[PDB]
Design a protein around this ligand. Sequence first.
Ligand SMILES: [Mg+2]
Ligand SMILES: [Mg+2]
Ligand SMILES: [Mg+2]
Ligand SMILES: [Mg+2]
Ligand SMILES: [Mg+2]
Ligand SMILES: [Mg+2]
Ligand SMILES: [Mg+2]
Ligand SMILES: [Mg+2]
Ligand SMILES: [Mg+2]
Ligand SMILES: [Mg+2]
Ligand SMILES: [Mg+2]
Ligand SMILES: [Mg+2]
Ligand SMILES: [Mg+2]
Ligand SMILES: [Mg+2]
Ligand SMILES: [Mg+2]
Ligand SMILES: [Mg+2]
Ligand SMILES: [Mg+2]
Ligand SMILES: [Mg+2]
Ligand SMILES: [Mg+2]
Ligand SMILES: [Mg+2]
Ligand SMILES: [Mg+2]
Ligand SMILES: [Mg+2]
Ligand SMILES: [Mg+2]
Ligand SMILES: [Mg+2]
Ligand SMILES: [Mg+2]
Ligand SMILES: [Mg+2]
Ligand SMILES: [Mg+2]
Ligand SMILES: [Mg+2]
Ligand SMILES: [Mg+2]
Ligand SMILES: [Mg+2]
Ligand SMILES: [Mg+2]
Ligand SMILES: [Mg+2]
Ligand SMILES: [Mg+2]
Ligand SMILES: [Mg+2]
Ligand SMILES: [Mg+2]
Ligand SMILES: [Mg+2]
Ligand SMILES: [Mg+2]
Ligand SMILES: [Mg+2]
Ligand SMILES: [Mg+2]
Ligand SMILES: [Mg+2]
Ligand SMILES: [Mg+2]
Ligand SMILES: [Mg+2]
Ligand SMILES: [Mg+2]
Ligand SMILES: [Mg+2]
Ligand SMILES: [Mg+2]
Ligand SMILES: [Mg+2]
Ligand SMILES: [Mg+2]
Ligand SMILES: [Mg+2]
Ligand SMILES: [Mg+2]
Ligand SMILES: [Mg+2]
Ligand SMILES: [Mg+2]
Ligand SMILES: [Mg+2]
Ligand SMILES: [Mg+2]
Ligand SMILES: [Mg+2]
Ligand SMILES: [Mg+2]
Ligand SMILES: [Mg+2]
Ligand SMILES: [Mg+2]
Ligand SMILES: [Mg+2]
Ligand SMILES: [Mg+2]
Ligand SMILES: [Mg+2]
Ligand SMILES: [Mg+2]
Ligand SMILES: [Mg+2]
Ligand SMILES: [Mg+2]
Ligand SMILES: [Mg+2]
Ligand SMILES: [Mg+2]
Ligand SMILES: [Mg+2]
Ligand SMILES: [Mg+2]
Ligand SMILES: [Mg+2]
Ligand SMILES: [Zn+2]
Lengths: 91, 63, 50, 77, 252, 112
Amino acid sequence: AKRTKKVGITGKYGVRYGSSLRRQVKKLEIQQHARYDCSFCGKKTVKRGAAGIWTCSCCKKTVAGGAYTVSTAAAATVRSTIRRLREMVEA
Amino acid sequence: AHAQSKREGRHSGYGKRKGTREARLPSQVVWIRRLRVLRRLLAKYRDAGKIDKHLYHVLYKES
Amino acid sequence: AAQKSFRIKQKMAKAKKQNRPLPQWIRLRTNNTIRYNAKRRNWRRTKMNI
Amino acid sequence: AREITDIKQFLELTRRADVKTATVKINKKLNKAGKPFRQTKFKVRGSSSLYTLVINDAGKAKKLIQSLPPTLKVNRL
Amino acid sequence: GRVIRNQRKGAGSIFTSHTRLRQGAAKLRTLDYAERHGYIRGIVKQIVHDSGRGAPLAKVVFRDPYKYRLREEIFIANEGVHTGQFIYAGKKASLNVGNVLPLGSVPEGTIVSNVEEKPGDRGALARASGNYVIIIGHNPDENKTRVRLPSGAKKVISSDARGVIGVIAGGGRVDKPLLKAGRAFHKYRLKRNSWPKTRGVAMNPVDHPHGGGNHQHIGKASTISRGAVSGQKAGLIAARRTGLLRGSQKTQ
Amino acid sequence: AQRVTFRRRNPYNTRSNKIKVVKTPGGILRAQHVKKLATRPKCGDCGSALQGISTLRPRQYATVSKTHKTVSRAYGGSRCANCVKERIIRAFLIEEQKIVKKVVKEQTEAAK
RNA sequence: AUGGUGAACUAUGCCUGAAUAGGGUGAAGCCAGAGGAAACUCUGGUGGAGGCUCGUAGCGGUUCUGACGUGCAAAUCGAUC
RNA sequence: UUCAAAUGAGAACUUUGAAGACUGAAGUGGGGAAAGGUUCCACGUCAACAGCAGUUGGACGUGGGUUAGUCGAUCCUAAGAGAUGGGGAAGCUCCGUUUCAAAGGCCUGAUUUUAUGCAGGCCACCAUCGAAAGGGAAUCCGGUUAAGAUUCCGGAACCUGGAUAUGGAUUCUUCACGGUAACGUAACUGAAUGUGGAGACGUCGGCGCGAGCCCUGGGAGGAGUUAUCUUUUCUUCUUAACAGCUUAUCACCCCGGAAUUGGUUUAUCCGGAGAUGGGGUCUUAUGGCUGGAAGAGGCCAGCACCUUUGCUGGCUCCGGUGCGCUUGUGACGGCCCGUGAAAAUCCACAGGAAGGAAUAGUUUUCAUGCCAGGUCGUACUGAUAACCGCAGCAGGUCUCCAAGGUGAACAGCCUCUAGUUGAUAGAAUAAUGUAGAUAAGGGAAGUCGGCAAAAUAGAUCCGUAACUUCGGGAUAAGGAUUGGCUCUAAGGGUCGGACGAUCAACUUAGAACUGGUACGGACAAGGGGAAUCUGACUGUCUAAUUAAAACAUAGCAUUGCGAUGGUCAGAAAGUGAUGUUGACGCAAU
Ligand SMILES: [Mg+2]
Ligand SMILES: [Mg+2]
Ligand SMILES: [Mg+2]
Ligand SMILES: [Mg+2]
Ligand SMILES: [Mg+2]
Ligand SMILES: [Mg+2]
Ligand SMILES: [Mg+2]
Ligand SMILES: [Mg+2]
Ligand SMILES: [Mg+2]
Ligand SMILES: [Mg+2]
Ligand SMILES: [Mg+2]
Ligand SMILES: [Mg+2]
Ligand SMILES: [Mg+2]
Ligand SMILES: [Mg+2]
Ligand SMILES: [Mg+2]
Ligand SMILES: [Mg+2]
Ligand SMILES: [Mg+2]
Ligand SMILES: [Mg+2]
Ligand SMILES: [Mg+2]
Ligand SMILES: [Mg+2]
Ligand SMILES: [Mg+2]
Ligand SMILES: [Mg+2]
Ligand SMILES: [Mg+2]
Ligand SMILES: [Mg+2]
Ligand SMILES: [Mg+2]
Ligand SMILES: [Mg+2]
Ligand SMILES: [Mg+2]
Ligand SMILES: [Mg+2]
Ligand SMILES: [Mg+2]
Ligand SMILES: [Mg+2]
Ligand SMILES: [Mg+2]
Ligand SMILES: [Mg+2]
Ligand SMILES: [Mg+2]
Ligand SMILES: [Mg+2]
Ligand SMILES: [Mg+2]
Ligand SMILES: [Mg+2]
Ligand SMILES: [Mg+2]
Ligand SMILES: [Mg+2]
Ligand SMILES: [Mg+2]
Ligand SMILES: [Mg+2]
Ligand SMILES: [Mg+2]
Ligand SMILES: [Mg+2]
Ligand SMILES: [Mg+2]
Ligand SMILES: [Mg+2]
Ligand SMILES: [Mg+2]
Ligand SMILES: [Mg+2]
Ligand SMILES: [Mg+2]
Ligand SMILES: [Mg+2]
Ligand SMILES: [Mg+2]
Ligand SMILES: [Mg+2]
Ligand SMILES: [Mg+2]
Ligand SMILES: [Mg+2]
Ligand SMILES: [Mg+2]
Ligand SMILES: [Mg+2]
Ligand SMILES: [Mg+2]
Ligand SMILES: [Mg+2]
Ligand SMILES: [Mg+2]
Ligand SMILES: [Mg+2]
Ligand SMILES: [Mg+2]
Ligand SMILES: [Mg+2]
Ligand SMILES: [Mg+2]
Ligand SMILES: [Mg+2]
Ligand SMILES: [Mg+2]
Ligand SMILES: [Mg+2]
Ligand SMILES: [Mg+2]
Ligand SMILES: [Mg+2]
Ligand SMILES: [Mg+2]
Ligand SMILES: [Mg+2]
Ligand SMILES: [Zn+2]
């Protein structure tokens, strides 16, 4: 009852395309089907639909963000870069 | 007359089947049959206190 | 053609009425050359093209 | 088109105005117990609605036929 | 020979953009008194997905300064901005992610999106899923600000050019393999008739300068003068060099 | 074992060509075309199904009484109870804090 | 050479619509059980993924180098596919 | 295909009767879209035409026939097409469609010389054409013809526009009450302006439910069969649009405050942001009852009698079943670098300009009543003869409805309803053929080459190699089994408190008995295995000699370009594609 060993969600692709493409797909396929925490809302209820739009089933809140994840590591660090500059323009 | 003999269980040996077992009766159908019977029995036994709500749960996950 | 335009049905009517044998008494007129309707039509031989 | 049940209103209908016609039907129905009774249906052609009234009791029925304005052309059976 | 395929694009026709399912065009608000001087607040009424454009869109609706009504503008959602977020726009609008500020009102190091090239042209640079431009410095000598554009080149533009704080949403789309022709098909099914692509070397001569066949080979250099005439411009155009490099970075 | 036919020249199974099978006083099978279903009107600012409001195709709302197109409360049609409860409270608390916004900023005015 | 006419066939994009028996496989997600000092690991279910598979209609046209080859047919017919 | 009769100068071929058969609901059945255009229907009729024939016809002659407020067109907008102020062009005209433009028309007061000039005033980057499959106001049943019918007849309705009067509701607290609330209602003023909603939307999957169909029990009829058996076989037993009450998964409200966490779907989601529980509110999709409506329709019976026609009576009832079939639909779920039209049109809310009563007025979103609803199409075929292929051509051309058995099954084979039995015919059975079969022994020795043929084949159980991108390879290979009959055991629903009552299914495993050892008995239905070259894969193309190893593809790399731009279009332009674009981009290899 373990089912697979490596492939997982990507048993779907069977044998085609070859390991690495299938491999890298798997990683992001898993990101985009994940259920994420809600900022405003607390609940683990943010599901994806269409690249970048991320909306909370429970409280109907929608966030812009990553194509395959809620929040870019690049967006994240820029978040901080911005606040950092902001706190300076009011100190 | 034949349909009669069929439910006397008569014309369905191993050489009277052309469909896979799954094809003639689907497994998922069986399960849903089997499952809802258990769900319903566990329900009745709760609205009757033959078993407590706590045991129920356990048996509900167990079914 | 089932649901048709007036204009065509219009032409269809004229096309039906042209379609008959030459009036026999015309063959009795004086100095008459005509013998038959040499412009007769029939839906299974020569089409109308609308 | 409409069923009527008030015995007061039905009479208010039999005159009305637009009412110039009505009809009287007799159904040989059966009751739940299974005894041959005589249901009689009273129908009045409105102007855009057929008000019909159902009376199971033959009594208040064969009374009511003689309760209509006699200036009303009534079809019988 | 015959008019080659790349010339045949210019007459539009078969090759126009498939735009039925698009929202509207994405633009910034028209630069008016409010945004010229102070700021103006709006609510993002929904964030939505434009067809043929990874990167979602923000329908954020402002009131009308000059009349009783609501005016919906179509913004490109800048990642993290959400429904119900308030969107303040103008010279005096504070440094939060989503607002749209002139390029003079932002400190060096600020990163922004959907920036105008001339003030009031309502958006121009950094608009593709995940992109952004970075202010590097300022200059009162004409209201100008120097930025870093996603391509890497630096451009000096008016400080009255607006941008919207932050990075375009739509994340790292290209990080995921298309896997199969089908997926690419649908991709361009919503953009434009450019797929698949027939290699010219598989053409006959009459369709392409490469199409000269009998062994599939380009025959002469594949690197064409900038001054060559349409009909000859196929391949590596005014290429100032060719081949593999590992170039790491760009123009700093 | 009886078969049937459209009653309109349109021969293609589209949406406007939906068909019902009906047995009739004739005791014969007959088709009837049914106008496509309606959808419940939706909350202005939360898109929920408006409760108490009847569900007809658009022009059929012109044939109908007005208790059919509302409920008795502010935003009868339009928005959905909690959507106006939230609406009211938000207004209050803000207008309240407006006062406070001002008396308080008036206060540190005299501080200077 | 000049001036005209064709996308009713066909190639491609767009718009709006319509269509495709029955089976084999059993991917994510979820439930329970067993072994174990632990970490974990095993078993049994459930679920129903795929430019997945056997195979009609559909679309196609591999082979017989079959039939026909003054034809049913200026491209068809049969089997096979 | 056959027999006979009828009609006729004349009969293999026409009609009626009988037999024998086919199509087998994926139809040789019933309708339509394109297209045709009278081919439809009746009568007369056979020179030509139907590659034999003809008394027959889609032929020839003569006539008849297509009835609408509700079915379409018509209105709307789609890709697009295209007038206008303009800008190019010697010009035929090219470009542009809100475009560098003085681009309008709505309300209503003033005036009671008048239905009218005007005095208020908001609102308007704005031709039009473009769907008989998209959007869309409203009709159903029965009956009727030689041929028309959602069009005529009869009955029952609905919509739209215009009129309006009576009733009812509302008010001295003027513009309604009730319910804690979700909200209820026969109503219950609402200009400008703003806003919200419907119109209005992908695909797949399992699950719930309706409709029709399928199967079936009792009975009330008719029919068949009856040497003998069968309380038997076949069949009839129906209920429209619309109206009233009633009816729902979802959802929402009130009470209440949860770890021993509970609730809970086939599918594991939900709950202090208020679960479970108790009690309500909604949507009316859909079902039930009644009206419509038995007077209709269906099935029988007894009389009547040249015809037309009847006439009089009965009966038309009460259940059951489900992984059933088709379809409709609900709440979920999977999928995307795809997230799956528009506009006309209808409604609502916010707003409160205004107009309104007490001896009286307000309101026609409540019931009732009056009037009108044009124009064009409407026949029929829709294909092995009504279209396109010179034709009555074995080709081609969009779509809907879909019964029984076997069986996994819309397969194959057999049948019912309906429809055909039409493809010149007679006599013989040489060669050689085209299509279908079979061969002793050998088993590819044939041949360029196993070409052609043969062999395998369902299902249950067992079993299963190298290699591998760990997914596969794999139905690998290799085996046993399979009929009939009689039994055994296991697997469910409902009603009464570990039993008990009642109902209703087939399916699964096992055992005995049996036969010329047969049994996926027809039908249906993979041959396998070891390698080399080669393209990764699914996909594509030389319509009519090449389907491949060629083209494509994902993947990889390179080039150009920051809009005063790159690539491309144009004779020219205030011209155009990419562009509803902006480097996670477009363009070029
Ligand atoms: Mg299955
Ligand atoms: Mg299963
Ligand atoms: Mg038509
Ligand atoms: Mg040329
Ligand atoms: Mg294109
Ligand atoms: Mg365009
Ligand atoms: Mg749109
Ligand atoms: Mg293409
Ligand atoms: Mg290529
Ligand atoms: Mg070539
Ligand atoms: Mg060259
Ligand atoms: Mg050349
Ligand atoms: Mg090469
Ligand atoms: Mg019709
Ligand atoms: Mg339509
Ligand atoms: Mg209501
Ligand atoms: Mg209501
Ligand atoms: Mg599957
Ligand atoms: Mg496979
Ligand atoms: Mg296959
Ligand atoms: Mg099969
Ligand atoms: Mg194909
Ligand atoms: Mg075929
Ligand atoms: Mg070939
Ligand atoms: Mg040949
Ligand atoms: Mg010959
Ligand atoms: Mg053969
Ligand atoms: Mg014959
Ligand atoms: Mg047969
Ligand atoms: Mg069949
Ligand atoms: Mg005749
Ligand atoms: Mg002849
Ligand atoms: Mg003859
Ligand atoms: Mg006539
Ligand atoms: Mg209509
Ligand atoms: Mg023009
Ligand atoms: Mg139009
Ligand atoms: Mg009729
Ligand atoms: Mg809308
Ligand atoms: Mg649509
Ligand atoms: Mg029986
Ligand atoms: Mg109706
Ligand atoms: Mg209560
Ligand atoms: Mg209803
Ligand atoms: Mg069921
Ligand atoms: Mg509404
Ligand atoms: Mg007709
Ligand atoms: Mg017809
Ligand atoms: Mg025919
Ligand atoms: Mg023809
Ligand atoms: Mg011709
Ligand atoms: Mg033909
Ligand atoms: Mg079917
Ligand atoms: Mg056959
Ligand atoms: Mg026929
Ligand atoms: Mg012949
Ligand atoms: Mg031999
Ligand atoms: Mg041998
Ligand atoms: Mg030899
Ligand atoms: Mg040889
Ligand atoms: Mg040899
Ligand atoms: Mg062979
Ligand atoms: Mg043999
Ligand atoms: Mg046996
Ligand atoms: Mg290949
Ligand atoms: Mg496939
Ligand atoms: Mg060829
Ligand atoms: Mg091939
Ligand atoms: Zn949330």
